[PDB]
């Protein structure tokens, strides 16, 4: 596919083609671990994709293979910049800004697909989970390490994982910190499909296209609806927000706006009280 | 064996022993429901709810059709769809399947979807809200909303996610692909798969295993499962059953008699248990 | 492994070795059914394990094989002592005290692993479910019987089961009261791994050891986090409670304590308001 570069970053690469955007984590020397900068850039890129009216689907993946032949989606938080209370940015401030990225991916009204080749570990594992869909290469390796490396993600990393693979498997994943193959990840319900490494991107594009032929309004409403099963009032905000969006496309709704601007009482008398 | 219980235009309705059977009968539209179909379905389920002998309802689609094809339900009849809903005979737009969803979900009888061939769109959601699903090996499952300009962001989304998990639920809705009976079982939304010509017999077999159980235990469990999903509405069903059971106690009856006899109640004999 | 007896009980056995405790239900004549006393002792043992700072993992299992060659994890509430409103203890009081045990297993900040050989039925099934993890022998048999024997567990027995195997299977389990093999139990997501009968304990020990090499603080926080997806404010209590525990290890927190004891206003001016 004709990928065009959309913006230049230090830690990532960002492209667009038709209704598809592609974001690539580009720190293969650290198994694509994110440092605070990486997250800022990821945030910026996803935000860009959110703002682009032509983009309906974002493919997220890791740069590879590395000089050692190994693939990686993301290895999570860069431990070489970790200190007191978080990951230290260039200015000395401790951060856990991936939490903001998690929220953006989760709430943005575009479908996000993780394309996992090789390692999706730790925060990189949580990143794949929060994407709407996951397509794995048959060399993909999934797991958490928190309790081994002195961390934990007790937010979407735990609760949301449990809403994917159930409570028994979710706990196993976190407590033992083992590694799981692509086939195991699919069997437990956290990977949508598995393809050969050299077919990964093409599968991503194929899935993106099947989505891009759908109604954008139906898709955004559904995404909000799924979030509403998890995120209480925050979820209701997204779902009700879309109801308001749709209501702002009605004649009935516009009558209320015009009435105010024209400084007259609104006339809703023609509109029925449906069952 | 099956005795007809009431006559309808769009559906068929039978009863035998503790089992009722409701059949969507519009095979010319792959058993799509129009507002009338829903009214009749509602009426039939309500009837089944009211019948003290009925413990289990089997829900299925009429088939095979003249073209040899099977269908459970294809969802909302798009040929009667207009502004704001599906237009009934009287011109009023409706989404009354939402009421049917609620009745199936809340009624204290076990409802089993028997899916042969297509369970698509609103027909897919209908199978989901039934307590159990038994599929024929020719069954085909899927959503189409984002393709045909619709969506079910209620039980169609959230409840689906409580069955197959969030990853698969989203795939189902976003891509609108079709899934085989075997795939549907593997992902957790179908309870078992049998050959087409064994579907009804399997339904009857499952119904019978349920019919030999305590009706009180079953209704309490169904409410309990709903309570994990439906907040205060779910608590209403569950607490409601607690009240029903409390109205079978001597302690509870003392309170009633005391009021009717215009005297203060005496609960002093009853302990405050741990 | 060198198991040392830790305390004597009538209905159960209790051992400890390294960071592992083992609790065994010992009433094989009733397929390890629990009577009120059994629950009291189980509670006491788990509570002991909770109090022991060396113990990080508890293995729960049933005594066997029985004289008839049959294995059992637990067969649930002892129906021979069941009367009006509950299971009658030795003093005549009806009880459903297993509900308290369920809560202790679920909330205690140690990982609990059910090792299921043969029958895990009824309340014994629910007991396996509330344990964090389940390892089954390939002879394991799982199921509920409530609607057959005039009972039901509409608490963790229903809702939590549904958070493991999904709503369709959970309902099947309860409505039909069939039996399910170890392989079926794994396939539906309620068993973490299946091993041969004579490997069950060794697998338990192996899993326990992989957990015991992890950070205890990370593990307790994760366990609370998983409970928070299910138990509303009770879940928030456990999770927030751990946040308080961690806050009580900070210098910032200690300044507040010292200020009060020294009868002076606290000085938090040096501490930043992080993003
Ligand atoms: C699982 C691997 C993907 C690959 O193994 P492999 O053997 O193939 O290569 P390896 O030698 O281990 O690594 C390759 C090189 O890249 C480095 N590297 C790999 N992954 C990371 C990494 N994640 N961070 C820093 N460096 C990394 C390695 O150190 C090494 O560098 P080098 O020795 O050449 O100098 C492995 O490297 C590994 O164990 N990585 C560590 C995973 C990890 O512990 N992540 C942190 C847990 S917490 C997490 O991600 C996270 C993040 C944000 C959070 C925010 C709020 C709340 C919670 C958060 C959270 O839990
Ligand atoms: C996937 C099939 C099951 C069957 O394939 P097949 O190729 O074998 O059949 P087909 O080619 O369509 O031919 C069958 C005949 O039956 C008709 N038919 C089948 N299903 C429907 C139908 N649902 N409505 C109207 N006509 C239908 C076809 O038009 C056609 O008639 P013909 O062209 O020969 O004159 C396919 O036909 C199909 O996509 N049918 C339409 C499914 C559909 O998208 N329904 C609406 C989605 S939403 C829905 O049901 C719904 C309902 C209520 C809701 C309420 C609140 C919120 C959301 C709701 C909701 O999302
Ligand atoms: C699958 C078995 C579990 C095994 O069959 P098997 O044929 O191999 O053994 P079996 O011959 O039937 O039984 C062996 C001996 O142990 C006895 N036994 C086995 N299980 C139990 C048992 N659970 N209670 C009392 N006795 C039991 C048998 O009666 C028999 O006694 P014996 O004739 O030698 O004198 C079977 O024994 C059996 O179905 N046992 C009954 C299981 C059961 O119904 N438990 C009660 C469901 S409800 C429950 O556990 C429960 C508990 C607390 C709750 C608290 C709050 C809310 C709900 C609760 C709740 O639902
Ligand atoms: Cl981790
Ligand atoms: Cl649909
Ligand atoms: Cl039971």
UniProtKB/TrEMBL annotation, chains A, C:
GO molecular function: 1,4-dihydroxy-2-naphthoyl-CoA synthase activity
Amino-acid positions noted as binding substrate in the UniProt annotation, renumbered to this chain: 31, 75-79, 87, 119-123, 145, 151, 248, 263
UniProt keyword Lyase present: yes
Binding site for hydrogencarbonate: 144-146
SUPFAM superfamilies attached to this UniProt entry: ClpP/crotonase
Catalysed reactions, semicolon-separated: 2-succinylbenzoyl-CoA + H(+) = 1,4-dihydroxy-2-naphthoyl-CoA + H2O
Site feature location: Important for catalysis: 87, 248
Physiological role: Converts o-succinylbenzoyl-CoA (OSB-CoA) to 1,4-dihydroxy-2-naphthoyl-CoA (DHNA-CoA).
NCBIfam families named in the record: menB, PRK07396.1
Name assigned to this protein: 1,4-dihydroxy-2-naphthoyl-CoA synthase
Underlying gene: menB
UniProtKB/TrEMBL annotation, chain B:
Enzyme Commission number: 4.1.3.36
Domain of life: Bacteria
Catalysed reaction equations from the record: 2-succinylbenzoyl-CoA + H(+) = 1,4-dihydroxy-2-naphthoyl-CoA + H2O
InterPro entries on file: ClpP/crotonase-like_dom_sf, DHNA-CoA_synthase_MenB, Enoyl-CoA_hyd/isom_CS, Enoyl-CoA_hydra/iso, Enoyl-CoA_hydra_C
Residues the entry annotates as binding substrate: 30, 74-78, 86, 118-122, 144, 150, 247, 262
Pathway: Cofactor biosynthesis; phylloquinone biosynthesis; Quinol/quinone metabolism; 1,4-dihydroxy-2-naphthoate biosynthesis; 1,4-dihydroxy-2-naphthoate from chorismate: step 6/7
Cofactor: hydrogencarbonate
Keyword vocabulary terms for this entry: Lyase, Menaquinone biosynthesis
GO BP field: menaquinone biosynthetic process; phylloquinone biosynthetic process
Residues noted as binding hydrogencarbonate in the record, renumbered to the chain: 143-145
Recorded GO MF terms: 1,4-dihydroxy-2-naphthoyl-CoA synthase activity
Site residues (Important for catalysis), renumbered to this chain: 86, 247
CDD domains, alphabetized: crotonase-like
Biological function: Converts o-succinylbenzoyl-CoA (OSB-CoA) to 1,4-dihydroxy-2-naphthoyl-CoA (DHNA-CoA).
Family from the record: Belongs to the enoyl-CoA hydratase/isomerase family. MenB subfamily.
Protein's UniProt name: 1,4-dihydroxy-2-naphthoyl-CoA synthase
Organism annotation: Synechocystis sp. (strain ATCC 27184 / PCC 6803 / Kazusa)
């Amino acid at each position: 596919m004709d990928w065009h570069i959309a913006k230049h970053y230090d830690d990532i690469l960002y492209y667009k083609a038709g209704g598809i955007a592609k974001i690539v984590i580009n720190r293969p020397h650290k198994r694509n671990a994110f440092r605070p900068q990486t997250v800022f850039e990821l945030y910026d890129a996803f935000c860009n994709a959110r703002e682009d009216n032509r983009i309906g689907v974002v493919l997220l993946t890791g740069a590879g293979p590395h000089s050692d032949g190994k693939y990686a989606f993301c290895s999570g938080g860069d431990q070489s910049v970790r200190g007191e209370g978080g990951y230290i940015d260039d200015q000395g401030t401790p951060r856990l800004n991936v939490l903001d990225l998690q929220r953006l991916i989760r709430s943005m009204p575009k479908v996000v697909i993780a394309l996992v080749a090789g390692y999706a570990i730790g925060g990189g594992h949580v990143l794949h989970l929060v994407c709407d869909l996951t397509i794995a290469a048959d060399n993909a390796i999934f797991g958490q390490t928190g309790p081994k490396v002195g961390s934990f993600d007790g937010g979407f990393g735990s609760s949301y994982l449990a809403r994917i693979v159930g409570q028994k498997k979710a706990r196993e994943i976190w407590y033992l910190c083992r590694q799981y193959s692509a086939q195991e990840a699919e069997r437990m319900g956290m990977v949508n499909t598995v393809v050969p490494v050299d077919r990964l991107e093409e599968e991503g594009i194929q899935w993106a296209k099947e989505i891009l032929s759908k109604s954008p309004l139906a898709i955004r409403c559904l995404k909000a609806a799924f979030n509403a099963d998890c995120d209480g009032q925050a979820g209701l905000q997204e779902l009700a927000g879309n109801a308001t969006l749709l209501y702002y496309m009605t004649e009935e709704g516009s009558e209320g706006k015009q009435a105010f601007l024209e400084k007259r009482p609104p006339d809703f008398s023609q509109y029925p009280w449906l069952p």
